[PDB]
């Protein structure tokens, strides 16, 4: 239970900094591109689940790293 | 969509070494415990979705790290 | 050894977002504190080695995560 | 100070499961290859500093993942 709460806040923190990185580097299209090829319907990238958000973020970091 | 299948193969690899780490240090109970608390019904840890598998793996590693 | 330039790019990217996270959440003191205890003399957090920077970053994320 | 201890144990745990992954998938040559290309001299992969151990581990996982 307490574990479920602690991990919830850890998860929330990770989601926020991933969302922050995607915005600051204008890579939000990665989220939509990946969402479009999975069936998820989102208005904001905040509505993206981890299965979409995390790959988007990693691609984003790679694109910035190798520019 | 090639990115999807690439991340599909990365997801599989990560699940495999998490599961491997959990067995080798006999921490499978972490998975079941977390599965039960979240209303998930599994007979073996390979059936656990990442939302319980990943926290269980993390608990496992800290348990070993601070034993 | 092209792998090494490539990993150097990824190292730089990771340093940059760790540093950005630390500044944007006003957690730079973590770096200086960890530096002082390790006999490392730095004037700014961009000079902290990863052995200092990474633990400060993680400490920083947990502090923000748990309020 | 308690941090220097806790992060030491985390570090040790992480080095151990990386070394275990490299051995179980017979990817030790990744470590020697990268170490030789950095002017470092090791007999065991256990003597590899994180700066060669970590990217060697990552290459190893990718090779297994995409094999």
Author numbering:
A (entry chain C), B (entry chain D), C (entry chain A), D (entry chain B): 122 to 188
Provide the publication's sentences verbatim.
The export apparatus consists of an export gate complex formed by 5 highly conserved transmembrane proteins (FlhA, FlhB, FliP, FliQ, and FliR) and a cytoplasmic ATPase complex consisting of FliH, FliI, and FliJ. FliP is a 25-kDa transmembrane protein that has a cleavable N-terminal signal peptide, 4 transmembrane (TM) helices, and a relatively large periplasmic domain (FliPP) between TM-2 and TM-3. Here we report that FliP forms a homohexameric ring with a diameter of 10 nm. In summary, we have presented direct evidence that FliP forms a homohexamer with the help of the FliO complex and that FliPP–FliPP and FliPP–FliO interactions are required for efficient FliP6 ring formation.
Although no St-FliPP crystal was obtained, the Tm-FliPP crystals were grown, and its structure was solved at 2.4 Å resolution. There are 2 tetramers in the asymmetric unit, and their structures are essentially identical. The 8 Tm-FliPP molecules in the asymmetric unit show no significant structural difference (root mean square distances for Cα atoms are less than 0.46 Å for the 8 molecules). Tm-FliPP monomer consists of 3 α-helices: α1, α2 and α3. The N-terminal 13 residues are invisible in the electron density map presumably because of their conformational flexibility. Therefore, the atomic model of Tm-FliPP contains residues from Thr-122 to Lys-188. Since each subunit of the Tm-FliPP tetramer is related by D2 symmetry, we studied 3 possible intermolecular interactions: between Mol A and Mol B (Mol C and Mol D), between Mol A and Mol C (Mol B and Mol D), and between Mol A and Mol D (Mol B and Mol C). The A–B interaction is hydrophobic, and Tyr-124, Phe-128, Met-154, Leu-155, Pro-176, and Leu-180 are involved in this interaction (S7A, S7C). The A–C interaction contains both hydrophilic and hydrophobic nature, and Met-127, Arg-130, Val-131, Arg-134, Phe-138, Glu-142, Glu-182, Val-185, Ala-186, and Phe-187 are responsible (S7B, S7F). There is no direct contact between Mol A and Mol D. Since sedimentation equilibrium analytical ultracentrifugation measurements have revealed that Tm-FliPP forms a homotetramer in solution, we conclude that the tetramer structure observed in the crystal appears to be equivalent to that in solution.
